[PDB]
Design a binder for this molecule. Structure first.
Ligand code: NA
Length: 374
């Protein structure tokens, strides 16, 4: 990552700055109105204007340290961005801690422009190497990167539908008893429609050799169909500061770490807050697991967390506060029992690692690491 790519990205960004001389720029804001005043103050700016040094003025409160204020301000925008009152962002039902665009955002009639704005902010922060406590779904990170969602990502977004997809994948198409079509229901702006996944989609049956393309098409549609206009607006704001070709250098895991930064994983904390199914605390590959995880630099530790959890966010209260689809859910490890040439797999909504009974430490370590990236 730092092995070349991150650094080209800075090189390429600095090259667009060539001959841009930045200014200082006021943000006049009231304390109880920080978010909306900030919108009013910045949304009509140009992208180039938006690359200026911000300094923030809190109306009618005593003169303060500019640096401390800007930091304070970014923190407020971070939390207020995700305030349910604006109806912009909604939590992952699987991962509880992560956010995407709320399909019901249209009840705020400014939502479209607020989405462009929040896009500009996120990208300004990244541009200026300011870290935000913003934690999105991996599907959302994939959207910024222009990367397609895999059916896997559906487990924490729509459990029943994901279960539907798995069933279709593992079964013969006439074994279903019913037959599917190249179309799904979508509720955009409150309105329900059945959208085709391709021309004449509604009249094209899914078959044994259709079903992969079907699964691909339906996930994209399901994940972005209600969201289209909001995403476009977000992506508009973001790409105006960081061009799409530049940001696309990163993977989805990397992108997240870039915005919010690298998390700290206290392994005594995590270990003290782990559950086991089929394995015991002292099963040999559990001991091997802990030994393995501890041997990871913090890059790989963070990526492992993303893998098993669906986010890089460590809870403020520690891993005893770890959450999942069914509520409070500790990290847990199961022995899966399928063949040993599998990689380990995760189901993030249950904060769950499925770990095969590997024959040796070195094999487990090597195999876990593989699972952590591709
Ligand atoms: Na999770």
């Amino acid at each position: 990552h730092s092995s070349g790519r991150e650094n080209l990205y800075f090189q390429g960004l600095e090259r667009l700055d060539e001959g841009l001389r930045k200014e200082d720029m006021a943000v006049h804001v009231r304390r109880d109105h920080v978010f909306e005043d900030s919108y009013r103050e910045l949304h009509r700016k140009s992208p180039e204007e938006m690359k200026n040094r911000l300094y923030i003025v809190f109306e009618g409160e005593e003169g303060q340290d500019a640096g401390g204020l800007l930091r304070e301000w970014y923190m407020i925008i971070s939390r207020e961005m995700f305030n349910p009152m604006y109806a912009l962002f909604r939590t992952s039902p699987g991962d509880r801690v992560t956010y995407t665009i709320n399909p019901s955002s249209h009840c705020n009639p400014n939502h479209l422009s607020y989405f462009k704005f929040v896009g500009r902010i996120v990208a300004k922060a990244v541009y200026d190497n300011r870290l935000l406590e913003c934690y999105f779904t991996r599907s959302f990170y994939k959207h910024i990167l222009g990367k397609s969602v895999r059916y896997t990502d559906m487990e924490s977004e729509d459990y029943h539908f994901y279960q539907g997809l798995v069933y279709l994948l593992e079964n013969d198409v006439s074994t279903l008893g019913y037959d599917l079509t190249f179309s799904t229901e979508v509720q955009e702006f409150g309105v329900c429609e059945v959208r085709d996944l391709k021309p004449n989609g509604a009249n094209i049956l899914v078959t044994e050799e259709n079903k992969k393309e079907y699964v691909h098409l339906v996930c994209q549609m399901r994940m972005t169909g209600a969201i289209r206009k909001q995403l476009a607006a977000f992506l508009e704001g973001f790409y105006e500061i960081i061009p799409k070709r530049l940001i696309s250098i990163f993977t989805e895991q990397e992108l997240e770490l870039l915005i919010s930064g690298l998390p700290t994983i206290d392994i005594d904390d995590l270990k003290s807050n782990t559950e086991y199914h089929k394995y015991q605390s002292n099963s040999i590959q559990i001991q091997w697991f802990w030994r393995a995880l501890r041997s990871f630099d913090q890059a790989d530790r963070a990526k492992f967390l993303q893998f098993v959890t669906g986010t890089s966010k460590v809870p403020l209260q520690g891993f005893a506060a770890l959450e999942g689809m069914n509520g409070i859910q500790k990290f847990q490890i199961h022995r899966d029992d399928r063949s040993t040439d599998r990689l380990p797999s995760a189901h993030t909504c249950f904060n769950q690692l499925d770990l095969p009974a590997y024959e040796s430490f070195e094999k487990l370590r090597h195999m876990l690491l593989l699972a952590i990236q591709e």
